[PDB]
């Protein structure tokens, strides 16, 4: 992770700063005091990591299955934020009804009409999912959704009789998104709750209509209700004129929450005796999480003061109901004391004792497996595909990687970096002014790396306080979400850690007195200068959260540290396809190593390349492959990078050799550790396979010539360690555990210290 | 071992210098050239390590069993050099015959005489070994030898009949001495050959007399021959007036060998056409080993020019026969091409390529076991004893140590220190002027450490060129032998390595033109400045041997690398006792460790101390315990010490930080390695036992108080590693693998580098 | 409830327990390892109850 510093986050992790959500302009410490309660449901965001796959057009229907994807599609990064999705679909819904044709056409595709209405239609209802593609002329639908979705009703099950089929199912999927929410996250999510309101009656009409309609007879003739059948939805289309401004509700609600908790009695702030109870947000008010949301939204908006409410009804009303209470999300409104469990602690002590190291870590234990990729392109020649994965790369590589999961028993990495303990004097007297306070058990890494953000850039921005901000709306707001959610995810592990807090002003600019922050008492430690809080008040009593948790004590991990991941094995034969893509894709990418002895530069040329035990290429396949697994590793790499940056700067800064001693130690704790890591990972076994195979091509290189032919002096004090890190490269790339790229980062550490074997072998 | 240096031995290992044997006054390089053949039987010294135990007074008799011990007694460090032994015994032999009494007394102890001569004596011949103690009044015999030995004849087996008993056996023993010889070694050994000449007839008389004597009758009455019986020996006593001056022979012989090989035709040098063949030393002349001997003796003596010979008979004669040809030794006259096999090689190459590192090592693989000690004091209340060893310490400790043997798969230690390879630039360009050339597979270490010399002091002297020389005659000449033999032992591994050589002058002072040395061609390497020899002459062509072998090539180990050691298990119940002592003795010695947390200095107090699994003390026992095992370890420790001395001096010398980089690397290759070693040795398991037991007392220390009672924060980043090196101390002392003492040497390395865990755990 | 502790099993219950079972209170706890390997394959009846 990243490290700071007791007085600081502020130079190198401003996102940490609440004031930024508060709007403190990067510097001044929460001054005000002058604070009231805070409290808990502990409170809104994601449970955790949920993975699932998706059935579409099954013909049983109902709102719940999609809106999720519709919720998800965003998550899917459908196009842009859900409300698009809802809007873009609703928009079809809007080139609405003047197409009674589809009814007319459904009626007309009621075969070929009721024109000979009679008791007749009997078959063919899987190709009118495929059919309601035929409906594409009336409504355009690259955004398959309705093009897929429009199907559902028409083939509700009605004709429940006559027809007939279908008797089959589709795929949806969804890999985890966020464990925590953000307010524009909220606005969409509400837009999802609205598509949700939308369906039922829509579910109901067809469902309703068909049972009521067919008194019959067996078939109740025809020219029938389906003519209404579809009629209801457009009717439904109009049925949306529009429920609320979800944006309106959400912003009004954020404003109300600020108020719910405000410091300033003045009335941008009149939280009622009349309505403060009244169910509603009253259970919600305690909630910190909304409070985090409030802090950010407000900075973003301040509060959007339209007072949609009156202080009675409404403020009774559009705040009557809320999205989270409405379930198109995979967010859930949080349990109330657990928070998001998953931490052991230790903290610094040269015997004095105090700390500026941390010991909070990853609570991780990732997948035991991974995925082939072949989109079974064949059936319908489009997205309709099946990867059709079979024993191939996937099983051998997995087992072999499956040490791979091993390197990163994440608690163990924190173990190493929490193994530190003594330098900087002892036992007793290490500590020198600056700190380190450090973090994270998988969700933040998981949220990004999957999302191609490569956290790292957002992270540098994070630290430097003010964000990097070149970024694309895709790019910029990847940054945004990751920075918001990351901080919040920590926060209700920060909020959770000590209930005492206090909603703080800031003051700051006016801007509208909204801006507000939180402080708490934690009692225990002797007075080792920890910011300005030691505590001076019995207890930590610092609004800065890192500040708050940090002056506290060790524990253990409640959490699973499960990597989760999705088996579709039932599907894995079942389907058919949802909106899948990123696989990763084609199975691997080539990487070789060349070694010198007797001085003959070679290059065996193994890739990347099967390695695996068959030839070759292979083909075909790849593995959008459990982020975590990439995730856990991303974290180890991050560590390397951080320490190195620090060192360089200080060594130039710190002339003293003793200072240099300290420096080698940090750089080369990275060095050493990375080196040890390399050795191990490479003696993973396959890689060891690379060692025999790549050697041999290098044997050919070792044995190309006659003179070279006496095969190796290539084996030296260095070699075994050399093609050992051939083994390192083999662990290193296209396992897919790591993308590549980084390789030079590891190089950077190896270079930094002779490292050598250092021994072995 | 020790390290040098291509241009040098001369600063830091002058013993290496032949010129010192030659007498070059510490500096000038063999200049002369001007040389003739040299050649091989390869030639005199010990086979290797032989261990055996000793039967005395069995009553079967014969010369061979003792003279060995008589040879051995010296080795036993009986008192002083054998010739003492022979002399001191011969000296009894000398308060000779005027004691017909013992005969008279034997006759008299022929029961109670023949006084009633008749056919009578029938019994009691185990207590006249014990009896011939009764003979002690006539001859004093603290030096039991004759007091024990005088017995043998009298109880030859004669009365072969009447008596009767004995029907039993004694113990002798002998643990290995030297694999190589030295000339005063020669003079004694010859003194042994002389006691050897002495016995037979002495064996023969009694043996002869008794068969001839008793025509009989059954018993042939008495008043008989035993009256001669003993008569022969004194007669034998006189029989020694004296065969040769063994000293005379030996010195005359050394002189003759010089000549045998001399450069100077002038005649301190007339090696005959008449007698150069003539069997004798002709097979011996080729022999280098005598040549090594010659070089040293001469320096010691020059040659002792009495020309005992004429150039025909004799120089035919006292050189006719020689001790080595005469077998009271455990030396044997060497095979002719094997030499003393046992070496793998690698040598330096940053790609250039050349070397100043070495890779010659220990060819070692030591004992699988060790010894209890209880001298079964009980029977006869003296030396007569039996340790009476039983399952106790010995088996458990052994198995546990038996990893102990593991740490020191000596090739593996050379492996580590031959793992070095790259620092000092690359690949390619490491080398900088100075070298290292390094050595030894067990005999030199084995010869000393057993002998309480603690090689190390002799070793510092070794290096510094001119010897330390405070030393006791015991002390000084421990130094002498170890330095002579060590060098020679290397030499006919140096002599063996390349047959080309050339007997060189020096010149030097006159002193008598005797002084002489050897040079050879070894061809192969490119011209990397290796002394002044690169070679400049096709081949190494350097008289300096290290110089000679060193410019040469890798191999493998023919030798056993057996630690040998002695099982008396048959005896282990059998006896009774020889001259045994050093055991070591009482089983162990106490050592504890105290740890601090929450800051409570403790000291668990475990010793040393059973550890073993029983209580306690125990008692009783100890283990004069396979030197090697101590031996192998002595070598690893030595390494530490050498590098550290170097570093300190250079860092003060070398201001540059880069220089310091180099320095940390050497000191802390020691550091690191010693540290790793410690971890491992301690996780030996018992020690791990110390870890649970010593912890617990420390738990008591950890749990003495209430506050302390929440047992450990004692377990830190440091702890496991702390009582882990409690484990280190446990491996560390009274296993007996190592004496102790050194502990601060390991400390010295641990101190030198944070070391830390460095990790783990 | 008489019993014993593995270290003390011999350490105390050492009498009841069979490492004694033989003579060998002795020097070292019976054991080591060795030579002719077998298990008898028989005690005989069930005799209890069977009133």
Q: Tell me the DSSP string of B520-533.
A: B----------TT-
Residue B614, C-beta contacts closer than 8 angstroms, at least 6 positions apart: none
Cβ-nearest to B422 among A599, A657, A756: A756
Contact present, A and C (at least 3 Cβ pairs less than 8 Å): no
Cβ neighbours around B338 below 10 Å, total: 11
Peptide bond into B428 cis (omega under 30): yes
Contact A360, A424 (CB under 8 A): no
Nearest Cα to B611, choosing from B588, B584, B583?
B588
Q: Nearest-5° angle of CA A736, CA A737, CA A742?
A: 95
Between helix B473-497 and helix B455-464 the angle, nearest 10°, is 70
Assigned token pair, A335: 């349990």
Nearest Cα to A273, choosing from A321, A236, A312, A225?
A312
Q: How far apart are CA A734 and CA A741, in angstroms?
A: 11
Give the determination technique: cryo-EM
Burial of B618 (0-12, 13-18, 19+ CB in 10 A): middle
Hunting for tokens 């930094």 — which residue is that?
A752
Query: What is the signed CA dihedral for A32, A36, A38, A44, rounded to 10 degrees?
Result: -70
Beta bridge mates, A355: none
B457 near A CB under 8 A: no
Assigned token pair, A377: 């392109």
Indicate the SS3 state at residue A622: coil
Q: How far apart are CA B202 and CA A287, in angstroms?
A: 112
With contacts defined as CB-CB under 8 Å, which chain B residues touch A660?
657
Alpha carbon A667 to chain centroid, angstroms: 30
Q: Nearest-5° angle of CA A453, CA A459, CA A462?
A: 125
Cβ neighbours around A37 below 10 Å, total: 11
Task: Report which DSSP code applies to A291.
Answer: H
Hunting for tokens 């009989």 — which residue is that?
B216
Nearest Cα to A581, choosing from A78, A55, A141?
A78
Assigned token pair, A589: 């990418």
Q: What's B713-740 look like in SS3?
A: CCCCCCHHHHCCCHHHHHHHCCCCCCCC
Q: How far apart are CA A387 and CA B418, in angstroms?
A: 53
Strands (DSSP E) found in A14-170: 45-46, 52-53
Cβ-nearest to B717 among A421, A757, A758: A421
Strands (DSSP E) found in A239-334: 331-332
Residue of chain C whose Cα is closest to the Cα of B618: C27
Residue B532, C-beta contacts closer than 8 angstroms, at least 6 positions apart: B7, B29, B542
Q: Report which secondary-structure segment, H or E, holds B196.
A: helix B183-213
Question: How does strand A517-518 pair with strand A503-504?
Answer: antiparallel
The residue among B350, B419, B429, B752 with the most chain A CBs within 10 A of its CB, best to mutate, is B419
Beta bridge mates, A235: none
With contacts defined as CB-CB under 8 Å, which chain C residues touch B392?
27-28
Cβ neighbours around A569 below 10 Å, total: 9
Q: How far apart are CA B188 and CA B195, in angstroms?
A: 11
Burial of A473 (0-12, 13-18, 19+ CB in 10 A): exposed
Cβ neighbours around A610 below 10 Å, total: 17
Alpha carbon B693 to chain centroid, angstroms: 38
Residue of chain C whose Cα is closest to the Cα of B399: C32
Residue A567, C-beta contacts closer than 8 angstroms, at least 6 positions apart: none
Peptide bond into A266 cis (omega under 30): no
Residue B198, C-beta contacts closer than 8 angstroms, at least 6 positions apart: B63, B90, B236, B239, B240
Assigned token pair, A435: 């700190």
Q: Report which secondary-structure segment, H or E, holds A444.
A: helix A443-449
Contact A492, A288 (CB under 8 A): yes
Q: How far apart are CA B15 and CA B22, in angstroms?
A: 11
Peptide bond into B535 cis (omega under 30): yes
Q: How far apart are CA A349 and CA B289, in angstroms?
A: 65
Beta bridge mates, A517: A504
Burial of B103 (0-12, 13-18, 19+ CB in 10 A): buried
Assigned token pair, B607: 């010793």
Q: Resolution in angstroms for this experimental structure?
A: 4.4
Alpha helices in B375-442 (DSSP H): 393-404, 410-417
Alpha carbon A73 to chain centroid, angstroms: 14
Between helix A183-213 and helix A144-154 the angle, nearest 10°, is 30
Distance from CA of B374 to the nearest CA of C (A): 13
Residue B470, C-beta contacts closer than 8 angstroms, at least 6 positions apart: B476
Q: How far apart are CA B59 and CA B126, in angstroms?
A: 9
Residues 411-440 on A with a CB inside 8 Å of B are 416, 418-423, 427
Q: How far apart are CA A551 and CA A538, in angstroms?
A: 12
Q: How far apart are CA C7 and CA A475, in angstroms?
A: 67
Alpha carbon B596 to chain centroid, angstroms: 44
| Own/partner pairs, A709-717, CB within 8 angstroms, 24+ separation | A712/A597, A713/A597, A713/A598, A714/A595, A714/A596, A714/A597, A714/A598, A715/A597, A716/A597, A716/B421, A717/A757, A717/B418, A717/B419, A717/B420, A717/B421, A717/B422
Contact A376, A385 (CB under 8 A): yes
With contacts defined as CB-CB under 8 Å, which chain A residues touch B418?
717
Hunting for tokens 């939805």 — which residue is that?
A233
Indicate the SS3 state at residue B116: coil
Backbone φ and ψ for A616, nearest 5 degrees, come out as -160, 165
Cβ neighbours around A556 below 10 Å, total: 12
B757 near A CB under 8 A: yes
CA contacts within 13 A on the Cβ side of A596:
9
With contacts defined as CB-CB under 8 Å, which chain B residues touch C12?
none
Beta bridge mates, A365: A562
Nearest Cα to A369, choosing from A580, A590, A564?
A564
Q: What's A726-745 look like in SS3?
A: HHHHHHHCCCCCCCCCCHHH
Nearest Cα to A409, choosing from A446, A375, A362, A374?
A362
Length of chain C: 51
CA contacts within 13 A on the Cβ side of B239:
18
- Cβ contacts below 8 Å, chain A against chain B, sum to 51
Q: Nearest-5° angle of CA A388, CA A390, CA A396?
A: 140
B216 near A CB under 8 A: no
The residue among A348, A662, A716, A722 with the most chain B CBs within 10 A of its CB, best to mutate, is A716
Cβ neighbours around A469 below 10 Å, total: 10
Contact A389, A467 (CB under 8 A): no
Backbone φ and ψ for B750, nearest 5 degrees, come out as -60, -40
Q: What's A354-417 look like in SS3?
A: CCCCCCCCCCCECCCCCCCCCCCCCCCCCCCCCCCCCCCHHHHHHHHHHHHCHHHCHHHHHHHH
- With residues binned 3-state (H G I as helix, E B as strand, rest as coil), the percentages for chain C, rounded to 5, are 20, 0, 80
Assigned token pair, A131: 């059919």
Contact B606, B712 (CB under 8 A): no
Contact A435, A347 (CB under 8 A): no
Contact A157, A209 (CB under 8 A): no
Peptide bond into A427 cis (omega under 30): yes
Q: How far apart are CA B505 and CA B261, in angstroms?
A: 12
Nearest Cα to B167, choosing from B56, B55, B58?
B58
Cβ–Cβ of B390/C32 closer than 8 Å?
no
Nearest Cα to B8, choosing from B609, B434, B465?
B434
Question: How does strand B52-53 pair with strand B173-174?
Answer: antiparallel
B665 near A CB under 8 A: yes
Cβ–Cβ of C28/B613 closer than 8 Å?
no
With contacts defined as CB-CB under 8 Å, which chain A residues touch B596?
351, 427
Nearest Cα to A296, choosing from A574, A515, A532, A89?
A515
Q: How far apart are CA B19 and CA B27, in angstroms?
A: 8
Q: How far apart are CA A589 and CA B4, in angstroms?
A: 50
Cβ–Cβ of A421/B660 closer than 8 Å?
no
Assigned token pair, B506: 């020096």
Alpha carbon B363 to chain centroid, angstroms: 15
Q: How far apart are CA A620 and CA B583, in angstroms?
A: 73
Strands (DSSP E) found in B510-598: 517-518
Question: How does strand B45-46 pair with strand B331-332?
Answer: antiparallel
Distance from CA of C22 to the nearest CA of B (A): 16
Q: How far apart are CA B561 and CA B414, in angstroms?
A: 14
Nearest Cα to B677, choosing from B705, B646, B639?
B639
CA contacts within 13 A on the Cβ side of A728:
22
Alpha carbon A408 to chain centroid, angstroms: 19
Q: How far apart are CA A47 and CA A492, in angstroms?
A: 12
Distance from CA of B70 to the nearest CA of C (A): 37
Between helix B288-301 and helix B473-497 the angle, nearest 10°, is 140
Q: How far apart are CA B405 and CA B368, in angstroms?
A: 7
Contact A86, A189 (CB under 8 A): no
Helices (H) and strands (E) in chain A, counts: 24, 6
With contacts defined as CB-CB under 8 Å, which chain B residues touch A716?
421
Beta bridge mates, B255: none
Contact A128, A147 (CB under 8 A): no
Cβ–Cβ of C28/B392 closer than 8 Å?
yes
Burial A227-247 (b: 16+ CB within 10 A, else e): bebbbbbbebbeebeeebebb
Cβ–Cβ of B390/C27 closer than 8 Å?
yes
With contacts defined as CB-CB under 8 Å, which chain A residues touch B758?
672
Indicate the SS3 state at residue A6: coil
Assigned token pair, B220: 């042939």
Q: How far apart are CA A438 and CA A455, in angstroms?
A: 16
Contact B754, A423 (CB under 8 A): yes
Rounded to a whole number of angstroms, the distance between the first and last alpha carbons of chain A is 32
Nearest Cα to A529, choosing from A511, A547, A505?
A547
């Amino acid at each position: 992770g990243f490290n700071l510093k007791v007085k600081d986050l502020n130079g190198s992790a401003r996102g940490l700063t609440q004031a930024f959500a508060i709007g403190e302009l990067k510097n001044q410490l929460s001054v005000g005091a002058l604070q009231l309660p805070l409290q808990f449901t502990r409170t809104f965001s994601a449970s955790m990591t949920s993975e699932l796959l998706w059935e579409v057009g099954k013909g049983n229907i109902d709102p719940v299955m999609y809106a999720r994807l519709f919720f998800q599609y965003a998550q899917a990064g459908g196009a842009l934020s859900v409300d698009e999705l809802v809007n873009q679909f609703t928009e079809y819904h809007q080139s609405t009804a003047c197409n009674p044709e589809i009814w007319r056409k459904l009626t007309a595709y009621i075969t070929g009409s009721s024109n000979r209405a009679i008791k007749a239609d009997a078959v063919g209802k899987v190709p009118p999912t495929a059919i309601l593609e035929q409906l594409r002329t009336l409504a355009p639908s690259e955004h398959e959704l309705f093009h897929h979705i429009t199907t559902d009703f028409v083939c509700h099950v009605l004709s429940p009789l006559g027809f007939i089929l279908p008797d089959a199912a589709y795929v949806y999927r969804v890999g985890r998104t966020a464990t925590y929410p953000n307010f524009y996250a909220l606005v969409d999510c509400v837009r999802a709750s609205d598509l949700r309101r939308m369906l039922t009656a829509l579910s109901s009409v067809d469902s309703k209509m068909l049972q009521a309609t067919f008194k019959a007879k067996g078939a109740l003739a025809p020219a029938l209700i389906s003519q209404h059948l579809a009629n209801a939805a457009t009717t439904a289309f109009e049925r949306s004129r529009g429920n609320f401004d979800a944006n309106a509700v959400v912003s009004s609600v954020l404003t109300i929450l600020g108020r719910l908790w405000s410091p300033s009695t003045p009335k941008e702030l009149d939280p009622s005796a009349r309505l403060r109870n009244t169910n509603g947000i009253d259970q919600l008010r305690s909630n910190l999480a909304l409070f985090i949301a409030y802090q950010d939204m407000v900075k973003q908006r301040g509060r959007a003061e339209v007072i949609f409410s009156d202080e009675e009804l409404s403020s009774t009303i559009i705040p009557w109901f809320i999205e989270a209470m409405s379930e198109v999300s995979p967010f859930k409104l949080r349990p109330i004391n657990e928070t998001t469990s998953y931490i052991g602690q230790t903290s610094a002590i040269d015997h004095m004792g105090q700390p500026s190291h941390v010991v909070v870590y990853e609570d991780w234990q990732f997948a035991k497996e991974i995925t082939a990729f072949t989109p079974v392109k064949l059936a319908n020649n489009s997205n309709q595909r099946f990867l059709d994965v079979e024993p191939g790369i996937s099983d051998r590589m997995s087992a072999t990687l499956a040490p791979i999961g091993n390197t990163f028993a994440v608690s163990a990495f924190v173990k190493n970096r929490t193994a530190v303990y003594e330098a900087v004097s002892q036992r007793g007297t290490v500590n020198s002014n600056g700190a380190e306070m450090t973090l994270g058990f998988p969700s933040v890494v998981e949220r990004d790396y999957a999302l191609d953000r490569d956290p790292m850039v957002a992270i540098a921005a994070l630290r430097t306080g003010i964000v990097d901000e070149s970024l694309e709306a895709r790019a910029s707001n990847d940054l945004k979400r990751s920075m918001f959610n990351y901080y919040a995810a920590v926060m209700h592990y920060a909020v959770a850690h000590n209930p005492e807090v206090v909603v703080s002003e800031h003051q700051g600019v006016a801007a509208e007195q909204g801006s507000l922050y939180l402080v708490w008492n934690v009692r225990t430690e002797l007075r080792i200068p920890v910011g300005y809080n030691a505590i001076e008040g019995g207890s930590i009593r610092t609004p800065e959260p890192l500040e708050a948790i940090a002056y506290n004590k060790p524990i253990q991990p409640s959490e699973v540290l499960q990597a989760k991941v999705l088996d579709l094995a039932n599907h894995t034969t079942s389907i058919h396809i949802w909106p899948w893509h990123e696989a990763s894709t084609e199975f691997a990418y080539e990487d070789a190593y060349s070694v010198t002895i007797r001085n003959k530069r070679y290059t065996a040329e193994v890739k990347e390349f099967e390695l695996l035990g068959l030839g070759q290429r292979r083909e075909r396949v790849r593995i959008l492959k459990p982020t975590v697994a990439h995730a856990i590793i991303q974290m180890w790499y991050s560590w390397f990078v951080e320490d190195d940056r620090t060192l360089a700067a200080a060594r130039r800064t710190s002339r003293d050799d003793a200072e240099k001693l300290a420096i080698d130690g940090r750089r080369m704790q990275n060095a050493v550790t990375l080196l040890r890591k390399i050795e191990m990972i490479g003696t993973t076994g396959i890689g060891a396979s690379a060692v025999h195979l790549a050697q041999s091509r290098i044997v050919d290189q070792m044995a190309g010539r006659g003179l070279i032919d006496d095969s190796s002096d290539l084996h030296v004090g260095i070699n075994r360690h050399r093609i050992r890190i051939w083994a390192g490269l083999a662990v290193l790339q296209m396992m897919g555990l790591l993308s590549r790229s980084e390789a030079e980062a590891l190089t950077k550490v190896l270079g930094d210290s002779n490292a050598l074997g250092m021994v072995v072998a």
